[PDB]
Design an enzyme around this catalytic site. Structure first.
Site, short mmCIF file in Angstrom:
data_model
loop_
_atom_site.label_atom_id
_atom_site.label_comp_id
_atom_site.label_asym_id
_atom_site.label_seq_id
_atom_site.Cartn_x
_atom_site.Cartn_y
_atom_site.Cartn_z
N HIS D 6 0.80 -1.22 0.00
CA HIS D 6 0.00 0.00 0.00
C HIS D 6 0.84 1.28 0.00
O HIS D 6 0.28 2.38 0.14
CB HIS D 6 -0.94 0.00 1.22
CG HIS D 6 -1.78 -1.23 1.34
ND1 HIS D 6 -1.46 -2.28 2.17
CD2 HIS D 6 -2.94 -1.58 0.73
CE1 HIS D 6 -2.38 -3.22 2.06
NE2 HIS D 6 -3.29 -2.82 1.20
N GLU D 183 -11.61 6.32 13.60
CA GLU D 183 -10.30 5.69 13.46
C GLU D 183 -9.45 5.47 14.70
O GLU D 183 -8.62 4.56 14.72
CB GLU D 183 -9.42 6.51 12.48
CG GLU D 183 -9.86 6.44 11.01
CD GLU D 183 -10.86 7.51 10.66
OE1 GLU D 183 -10.90 8.53 11.39
OE2 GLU D 183 -11.61 7.33 9.67
N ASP D 206 -19.59 19.17 14.14
CA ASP D 206 -21.03 19.30 14.34
C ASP D 206 -21.49 18.68 15.65
O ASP D 206 -20.82 17.81 16.22
CB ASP D 206 -21.84 18.64 13.22
CG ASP D 206 -21.62 17.20 13.17
OD1 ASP D 206 -20.44 16.81 13.08
OD2 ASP D 206 -22.61 16.45 13.27
#
Lengths: 237, 237, 237, 237, 237, 237
Positions: D6, D183, D206
């Site tokens: 990756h 995460e 928010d």
């Protein structure tokens, strides 16, 4: 118009006390050999049930099939629709405990399980499938009067007859579970739900670990012993 | 000389039968008022334990603290190090069952729980914390001899005294749990592990749902009834 | 009429900062040796609690018993009824980390557990039992000011002192858990519920794997260090 | 032959300290605006990573994608192959806590989750995903020096951005979770596994419950504040 | 104002059929090489999405990132906001099945997972993440018309690319799981929720057990084959 | 010496393709009405099984009883001892899906469950009980050839016929489960274990939500359609 989807008996056709075994052909053997004036009251799905008397007291006997879902269907209907008050399961089991012997009848006080049906009744927590004390006591007292050796203790009800689970038998033995079978953990909470009574008595048909199996005569003696205990217990209940 | 990290008693200082309650000061009251020739054998962590006789038979009484982890420490040690054969827990409980009344004595056949300790013993499956049948029978028979009404059935051992859990009491009531307390589900499997015996008897100090609580006068009477039942039961064990 | 079922103290009898340890007799030693003008404020169930001052600030100390259910009862009451704002647990622990040594004090930032009490607070999910950052910082800063080395990191709170679980210690070591004890994971979520503060500091009394134990002299030295750290931290909170 | 499946960077191409955010285009903005002598070192799957210096100290910045499985791939590789020592996640979050206000900076001490990844690391038990204390302290001190108010406390990392789960927000609020994101609960245990350090800092974009959302100007200001805190914190690590 | 927080496409910008792969640069390659008149409709977070036609029929292609949380965000939005009717995941997978070979195309009928997301949708029970039968059949028939051999069966979607789990690969092989990847078990239930369709086709890039890896040329051939199957299947859907 | 504890048939007495239904008396009806030269090959526990030919192809039919534990016993034995290659369950079901109606034929692609048996096969993870695609396809193509409409999709196999579970039907309907029954989730993974094939086809006898129930006349017509579809499908397998 059948009283339940699984039973053609009419309300009143079952006595308030019912003996149940897994094999409907065994239910017929019990009714034919131990009940007076037995009548067949169900044959839906071949799950034969009978009602007669034992020493003058009404008594029924019926098959329940294999596994918790099967016995749950038949027991729920018996308590709910047929207004049964007491069910005694009579069956066979395997054992992992070396102190338990094939000539021992096992009287079940409570049953563990690998099923989810009791977690689902109690918000995911541990719900002990527990036999009714009067039923256990009647069974213990009957075995003593009949001079039949017994073991009294915990069963383990599994959904998988053909187990592949490493470490299970060793853990069951460490905590002295005396019987491994497939139904009783489903029966007891249903009895609780209806405010009714249940118990279980089993004969040892094999030592699960050593794979030693009971001889045909040992099976005959323990079956007769178990059934005599159960029938006498019905007179006290 | 500490035989265990939690007990200064020497091996042999405990009788083969031990009554245990949560409050070490209540253990002292039981020893002072009901035992002959009681001597204090432990005071580590203030968890008082005593040994004397009841009607000539050796008997110990000791505190176990609050919750499954606490009683597990003390009971594991008593069975393993001190070679105790029988533990009877004596306590109070709440009830959710409308048929159980404050001032009723509850004899526990098995206990559910929201603890993980019994799943960890049985490969994550349902392991019923089950009382020994001879202990239950001894308690039931003594209560009958003393003409004290009893409820015999399931307890529920919780980790959380200050419960915030919606729906729990309704489920406990539906399945006729008779006693809510905090320890017995931890005791019974340890007795299994050591091949020993355990039981539990509790007085109802409040109805959890209705919030009716027993008066100090009612609590005194029910404690006296319960303790006499347990003491008489030890003579049969 | 007792302010709680487990505590005879009146509201106001506890300071806003409370040190707690499992052993009530150790709480008494702390109060008697380190608090000025200590007064006993509770003895219910032998769970001794005291209130005095330390360098001019009111400070209390009280036992919490063994295990999550026990500390949960006492901490819930202290935050709710007695309006305590900060609890610092002071204790001992075992270690699996080869990098942690018996002369090390462990300051706990968060605690894992095998208990179910935190899953039940968060719809079955993972709820990290997390120390308050100001409390952690005060302990770290006090140890630096006292020139006492510390380990800072995760604890693991177990329900079972007498563990039989294979593979646990290896996993704890792999992820650098610094302390194994039995209460801090039940304390931190209760502080959260009441919008209050909690922390934990423990001394290393044994290496779980090797079964190596600190000598009595090592235990006294590390206890003196840990209590010195905790008392100085109270001055910053 | 790429160093990982990756990441095309060579070993050594990453500094020992890495900032990571979910959006690779945000990583590019951070590199372009705050790093000196920055070079792109990865573009596999568009997941841009960069290495330069910040006020003389080597520093990398890289995207991590959305969700625990994504950050777990990138972080595992950075610690294992690239020998990174410290990762600080920088992000946005939603809040349920009324005391937390849009444009508040949240410094994460530990994170809960509805993922299974941490139960799988600790034999099914509760494993708190816990930030490194020196990283937390560095973030807190940096914000203090810049006079930016902070909230310090627990995050909750969910697998499901589009939640349909009733009661979750109320429970998060009851226990004063300050940040909801996707995460950090995956990052902290990987850092543990490699004996390394991780932290997380988030801005509130928010209020999940009221659906009040931060304005674009609040978003830019809060991002500028957060990133300066994170960068200044790297100088202490 | 963006139609979703993760996608700048306007309503109508996506065709009713969407191919999705993990790598947005692969989505761009597919759009550039196989779609006519491709228009980029999203680049938020670098997650490139495109809409054009394939043999006269509208078709979109877009990246979904790595892992169930990432595809769940993008798929929910496509079904809900963009009114997509069919999504086919195109990807690579590992295999444990000895009968499956590198360069074999796997068409997924259902996918298991170690994620919690589907238990959370079905009251904690087993919810099979199941492909739509018309999509499965369209893929099967397209591969046949193209004379490309296929394996049809179960995939397993893991949250953890860097697995440390002993026994996993043997169980997957015992039950003939044909593909190990990281997303399809999150896609299929979202399609169910919106009454829409989903499928998955993967090429085997390595044998997880033997550690045999497909050559770079074999990967290009297998990708061309897989993509050809998927594009042709859209003509039937 | 019986080939299994539950089946008196000799190896070779069963055809390689077996239709199974719950009711052994329905199996007898199937054999008597549709099989040529049918022979009874089992009657243990009344669980009748038969072997004959259908349009020249050998075919067996046998009851499997009620619930996952019961079908697991019979199916394991058929695959393992009797060397069966394909089992198709034929049954009735309830539906909660508003698009599914009484008298609809349901072909099952995969089945959910509240049982634990499949978690126990896959290290506690989600294992989708998945029908073989060639079997699903053959059933689908047979129904098309006979001009009988079918629904193709997910089933849900429950342990509890008398459900008391709030919210279950609503979730099943939300994710478009088309059939509720009690066995298929236990069958499919056993077929997988043995490298064999399984499927399921069910007629809708009632809508669980609307409580619409099929007339006896409609049930016979749907049984006849279903059985002809299954029998014709065996000629293609």
């Amino acid at each position: 118009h059948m009283a339940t989807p699984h039973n053609s008996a009419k309300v009143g056709d079952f006595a308030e006390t019912v003996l149940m075994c897994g094999d409907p052909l065994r239910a017929k053997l019990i009714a034919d050999n131990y009940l007076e004036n037995a009548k067949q009251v169900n044959s839906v799905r071949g799950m034969l049930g009978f009602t007669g008397t034992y020493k003058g007291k009404p008594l029924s006997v019926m098959g329940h099939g294999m596994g918790i879902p099967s016995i749950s269907i038949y027991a729920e209907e018996l308590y709910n629709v047929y207004k049964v008050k007491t069910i005694i399961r009579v069956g066979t089991c395997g054992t992992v405990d070396p102190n338990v012997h094939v000539r021992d009848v096992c009287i079940v006080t409570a049953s563990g399980t690998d099923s989810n049906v009791n977690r689902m009744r109690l918000l995911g927590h541990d719900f002990p499938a527990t036999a009714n004390f009067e039923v256990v006591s009647a069974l213990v007292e009957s075995a003593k009067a009949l001079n039949i050796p017994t073991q009294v203790g915990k069963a383990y009800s599994t959904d998988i007859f053909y187990s592949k689970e490493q470490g299970l038998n060793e853990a069951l033995a460490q905590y002295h579970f005396i019987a491994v079978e497939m139904e009783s953990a489903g029966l007891f909470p249903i009895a609780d739900y209806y405010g009714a009574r249940a118990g279980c008595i089993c004969t040892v048909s094999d030592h699960i670990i050593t794979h030693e199996s009971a001889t045909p005569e040992e099976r005959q003696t323990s079956f007769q012993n178990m059934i005599k205990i159960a029938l006498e217990a019905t007179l006290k209940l």
